[PDB]
Coordinates of all heavy atoms in Angstrom, one line a residue:
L1 N 0.8 -1.3 0.0 CA 0.0 0.0 0.1 C 0.9 1.2 0.0 O 0.6 2.2 -0.7 CB -0.9 0.0 1.2 CG -1.9 1.1 1.3 CD1 -2.7 1.2 0.1 CD2 -2.8 0.9 2.5
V2 N 1.9 1.3 0.8 CA 2.9 2.3 0.8 C 3.5 2.5 -0.6 O 3.6 3.7 -1.0 CB 4.0 2.1 1.8 CG1 5.2 3.1 1.7 CG2 3.4 2.3 3.2
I3 N 3.8 1.4 -1.3 CA 4.5 1.6 -2.6 C 3.6 2.1 -3.7 O 4.0 2.9 -4.6 CB 5.1 0.2 -3.0 CG1 6.5 0.1 -2.3 CG2 5.4 0.1 -4.5 CD1 7.4 1.4 -2.6
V4 N 2.3 1.7 -3.6 CA 1.3 2.3 -4.5 C 1.3 3.8 -4.2 O 1.3 4.7 -5.0 CB -0.2 1.9 -4.2 CG1 -1.2 2.5 -5.0 CG2 -0.1 0.3 -4.8
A5 N 1.3 4.2 -2.8 CA 1.3 5.7 -2.5 C 2.5 6.4 -2.8 O 2.4 7.6 -3.1 CB 1.1 5.7 -1.0
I6 N 3.7 5.8 -2.9 CA 5.0 6.5 -3.2 C 4.9 6.6 -4.7 O 5.2 7.8 -5.2 CB 6.2 5.7 -2.8 CG1 6.2 5.6 -1.2 CG2 7.4 6.6 -3.1 CD1 6.1 6.8 -0.5
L7 N 4.6 5.7 -5.6 CA 4.8 5.7 -7.0 C 3.6 6.6 -7.7 O 3.9 6.9 -8.9 CB 4.9 4.4 -7.6 CG 6.3 3.8 -7.7 CD1 6.8 3.2 -6.3 CD2 6.5 2.7 -8.8
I8 N 2.5 6.7 -7.0 CA 1.7 7.9 -7.5 C 2.3 9.1 -6.7 O 2.7 9.0 -5.6 CB 0.2 7.7 -7.3 CG1 -0.1 7.5 -5.9 CG2 -0.2 6.5 -8.1 CD1 -1.7 7.5 -5.6
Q9 N 2.2 10.4 -7.3 CA 3.1 11.5 -6.9 C 2.2 12.7 -6.5 O 2.5 13.8 -6.9 CB 4.1 11.7 -7.9 CG 5.2 10.8 -8.1 CD 6.2 11.2 -9.2 OE1 6.0 12.3 -9.8 NE2 7.2 10.4 -9.3
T10 N 1.3 12.4 -5.6 CA 0.5 13.5 -5.0 C 1.0 13.8 -3.6 O 1.4 13.0 -2.8 CB -1.1 13.0 -5.0 OG1 -1.4 12.6 -6.3 CG2 -2.0 14.2 -4.4
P11 N 0.9 15.3 -3.2 CA 1.1 15.6 -1.9 C 0.2 14.9 -0.8 O 0.7 14.6 0.3 CB 1.0 17.1 -1.9 CG 1.5 17.4 -3.3 CD 0.9 16.3 -4.1
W12 N -1.0 14.7 -1.2 CA -2.0 13.9 -0.4 C -1.4 12.5 -0.1 O -1.4 11.9 0.9 CB -3.3 13.7 -0.9 CG -4.1 15.0 -1.2 CD1 -4.2 15.8 -2.2 CD2 -5.0 15.5 -0.1 NE1 -5.0 16.9 -1.9 CE2 -5.5 16.7 -0.6 CE3 -5.2 15.2 1.2 CZ2 -6.4 17.6 0.1 CZ3 -6.1 16.1 1.9 CH2 -6.6 17.1 1.4
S13 N -0.9 11.9 -1.3 CA -0.3 10.5 -1.2 C 1.0 10.5 -0.3 O 1.2 9.5 0.4 CB 0.0 10.0 -2.6 OG 0.6 8.8 -2.5
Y14 N 1.8 11.5 -0.3 CA 3.0 11.5 0.5 C 2.6 11.7 2.0 O 3.3 11.1 2.8 CB 3.9 12.6 0.1 CG 4.7 12.2 -1.2 CD1 5.6 13.1 -1.8 CD2 4.6 10.9 -1.7 CE1 6.2 12.8 -3.0 CE2 5.3 10.5 -2.9 CZ 6.1 11.5 -3.5 OH 6.8 11.1 -4.6
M15 N 1.5 12.5 2.3 CA 1.2 12.7 3.7 C 0.6 11.4 4.2 O 1.0 11.0 5.3 CB 0.2 13.8 3.8 CG 0.8 15.2 3.6 SD -0.3 16.6 3.8 CE -1.3 16.5 2.3
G16 N -0.3 10.8 3.4 CA -0.7 9.5 3.8 C 0.3 8.4 3.9 O 0.3 7.5 4.7
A17 N 1.3 8.6 3.1 CA 2.5 7.6 3.0 C 3.4 7.7 4.3 O 3.5 6.6 5.1 CB 3.4 7.9 1.9
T18 N 3.6 8.9 4.8 CA 4.4 9.0 6.0 C 3.7 8.7 7.2 O 4.2 8.2 8.2 CB 5.1 10.4 6.2 OG1 5.8 10.4 7.3 CG2 4.1 11.5 6.1
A19 N 2.4 9.0 7.2 CA 1.5 8.6 8.4 C 1.3 7.1 8.5 O 1.5 6.5 9.6 CB 0.1 9.3 8.3
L20 N 1.3 6.4 7.3 CA 1.1 5.0 7.3 C 2.4 4.3 7.8 O 2.4 3.3 8.5 CB 0.6 4.6 6.0 CG 0.4 2.9 5.8 CD1 -0.7 2.5 6.7 CD2 -0.1 2.7 4.4
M21 N 3.6 4.9 7.2 CA 4.9 4.4 7.7 C 5.0 4.4 9.3 O 5.3 3.4 9.8 CB 6.0 5.4 7.1 CG 6.2 5.0 5.6 SD 7.6 6.1 5.1 CE 7.5 5.9 3.3
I22 N 4.7 5.6 9.9 CA 5.1 5.7 11.3 C 4.1 4.9 12.1 O 4.5 4.2 13.1 CB 5.2 7.2 11.7 CG1 6.2 7.9 10.8 CG2 5.5 7.4 13.1 CD1 6.0 9.4 10.8
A23 N 2.8 4.9 11.7 CA 1.8 4.3 12.5 C 1.9 2.7 12.4 O 1.9 2.0 13.3 CB 0.4 4.6 12.0
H24 N 2.3 2.3 11.1 CA 2.4 0.7 11.0 C 3.7 0.3 11.7 O 3.8 -0.8 12.2 CB 2.5 0.5 9.6 CG 2.7 -1.1 9.3 ND1 1.8 -2.0 9.6 CD2 3.8 -1.7 8.9 CE1 2.4 -3.2 9.4 NE2 3.5 -3.1 8.9
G25 N 4.9 1.2 11.7 CA 6.0 0.8 12.5 C 5.6 0.6 14.0 O 6.0 -0.4 14.6
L26 N 4.9 1.5 14.6 CA 4.5 1.4 16.0 C 3.6 0.2 16.2 O 3.9 -0.7 17.1 CB 3.7 2.6 16.4 CG 4.6 3.9 16.7 CD1 3.7 5.1 16.9 CD2 5.5 3.7 17.9
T27 N 2.7 -0.1 15.2 CA 1.7 -1.2 15.4 C 2.5 -2.6 15.3 O 2.2 -3.4 16.0 CB 0.6 -1.0 14.5 OG1 -0.1 0.2 14.7 CG2 -0.5 -2.2 14.7
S28 N 3.3 -2.6 14.3 CA 4.0 -4.0 14.1 C 5.0 -4.3 15.1 O 5.2 -5.4 15.4 CB 4.6 -3.9 12.7 OG 5.7 -2.9 12.7
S29 N 5.7 -3.2 15.6 CA 6.6 -3.4 16.7 C 5.9 -3.9 17.9 O 6.5 -4.8 18.7 CB 7.4 -2.1 16.9 OG 8.3 -2.3 18.1
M30 N 4.8 -3.3 18.3 CA 4.0 -3.8 19.4 C 3.6 -5.2 19.3 O 3.8 -5.9 20.1 CB 2.8 -2.9 19.6 CG 2.0 -3.3 20.8 SD 0.5 -2.5 21.0 CE -0.3 -3.3 22.5
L31 N 3.0 -5.5 18.1 CA 2.4 -6.8 18.0 C 3.4 -7.8 17.8 O 3.2 -9.0 18.3 CB 1.5 -6.7 16.7 CG 0.4 -7.8 16.5 CD1 -0.4 -7.8 17.8 CD2 -0.4 -7.4 15.3
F32 N 4.7 -7.6 17.3 CA 5.7 -8.4 17.5 C 6.1 -8.8 19.0 O 6.6 -9.9 19.3 CB 7.0 -8.0 16.7 CG 7.0 -8.4 15.4 CD1 7.7 -7.6 14.4 CD2 6.2 -9.5 14.9 CE1 7.7 -8.1 13.0 CE2 6.2 -9.9 13.6 CZ 7.0 -9.3 12.7
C33 N 6.1 -7.7 19.8 CA 6.3 -7.8 21.2 C 5.3 -8.7 21.9 O 5.8 -9.5 22.8 CB 6.5 -6.4 21.8 SG 7.0 -6.6 23.5
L34 N 4.1 -8.6 21.5 CA 3.1 -9.4 22.1 C 3.2 -11.0 21.7 O 3.0 -11.9 22.5 CB 1.7 -9.0 21.6 CG 0.9 -8.0 22.5 CD1 1.3 -6.7 22.2 CD2 -0.5 -8.0 22.2
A35 N 3.7 -11.2 20.4 CA 3.9 -12.5 19.9 C 5.1 -13.2 20.7 O 5.1 -14.2 21.0 CB 4.1 -12.6 18.4
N36 N 6.1 -12.3 20.9 CA 7.3 -12.6 21.8 C 6.7 -13.0 23.1 O 7.3 -14.0 23.8 CB 8.3 -11.5 21.9 CG 9.6 -11.9 22.6 OD1 9.7 -13.2 22.7 ND2 10.3 -11.0 23.1
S37 N 5.9 -12.3 23.8 CA 5.3 -12.5 25.1 C 4.7 -13.9 25.1 O 4.9 -14.8 26.1 CB 4.6 -11.4 25.6 OG 3.9 -11.7 26.9
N38 N 3.9 -14.3 24.2 CA 3.1 -15.5 24.0 C 4.1 -16.7 23.8 O 3.9 -17.7 24.4 CB 2.1 -15.4 22.9 CG 1.0 -16.4 23.1 OD1 1.0 -17.3 23.9 ND2 0.1 -16.4 22.1
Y39 N 5.2 -16.5 23.1 CA 6.1 -17.5 22.8 C 7.0 -17.7 24.1 O 7.4 -18.8 24.4 CB 7.0 -17.2 21.7 CG 8.0 -18.3 21.4 CD1 7.6 -19.6 20.9 CD2 9.3 -18.2 21.7 CE1 8.6 -20.5 20.6 CE2 10.4 -19.2 21.5 CZ 9.9 -20.3 20.9 OH 10.8 -21.3 20.7
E40 N 7.1 -16.6 24.9 CA 7.9 -16.9 26.2 C 7.0 -17.6 27.2 O 7.5 -18.3 28.1 CB 8.4 -15.6 26.7 CG 9.6 -15.0 26.0 CD 10.1 -13.6 26.5 OE1 9.4 -13.1 27.5 OE2 11.1 -13.2 26.1
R41 N 5.7 -17.4 27.0 CA 4.8 -18.3 27.9 C 4.9 -19.6 27.4 O 5.1 -20.6 28.3 CB 3.3 -17.7 27.8 CG 3.2 -16.3 28.3 CD 3.4 -16.3 29.9 NE 3.2 -15.0 30.4 CZ 4.1 -14.1 30.6 NH1 5.4 -14.3 30.3 NH2 3.8 -12.9 31.1
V42 N 4.6 -19.9 26.1 CA 4.5 -21.3 25.7 C 5.4 -21.5 24.5 O 5.3 -20.6 23.5 CB 3.1 -21.8 25.4 CG1 2.5 -22.1 26.7 CG2 2.4 -20.8 24.6
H43 N 6.3 -22.5 24.6 CA 7.4 -22.6 23.5 C 6.9 -23.4 22.2 O 7.5 -24.4 21.8 CB 8.6 -23.3 24.1 CG 9.1 -22.5 25.4 ND1 9.8 -21.4 25.3 CD2 8.9 -22.9 26.6 CE1 10.1 -21.0 26.5 NE2 9.7 -21.9 27.3
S44 N 5.9 -22.8 21.6 CA 5.3 -23.5 20.5 C 5.4 -22.8 19.1 O 5.6 -23.4 18.0 CB 3.9 -23.8 20.7 OG 3.2 -24.3 19.6
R45 N 5.2 -21.4 19.1 CA 5.2 -20.4 18.1 C 4.0 -20.6 17.1 O 3.7 -19.9 16.2 CB 6.5 -20.6 17.3 CG 6.9 -19.4 16.3 CD 8.3 -19.6 15.7 NE 9.3 -19.4 16.6 CZ 10.1 -20.4 16.9 NH1 10.0 -21.6 16.5 NH2 11.1 -20.1 17.9

C-alpha cells in the first residue's frame, strides 16, 4: 500500500505515506512484542 502511495506522486499521497509508515511501525513493533510474550509463555510459536 505504501509503494502504491509512493509511485503515485500526489502531496496527499505523501502525507498518507508518512502517516502509514510511522503508525504501522509502531503497530507492528508492538504486535511482535506481544507474539514474543506469548512464545515466552509457551514454546510452540
Side-chain angles (χ1 to χ4, degrees):
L1 183 59
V2 168
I3 279 303
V4 173
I6 303 302
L7 274 78
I8 62 173
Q9 290 184 356
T10 302
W12 294 98
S13 180
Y14 284 173
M15 290 183 283
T18 180
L20 184 59
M21 283 180 187
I22 302 163
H24 178 71
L26 287 172
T27 302
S28 66
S29 177
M30 181 186 178
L31 197 56
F32 274 157
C33 184
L34 273 78
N36 189 16
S37 178
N38 198 1
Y39 182 74
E40 288 180 352
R41 293 294 182 270
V42 286
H43 303 285
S44 176
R45 193 179 293 114

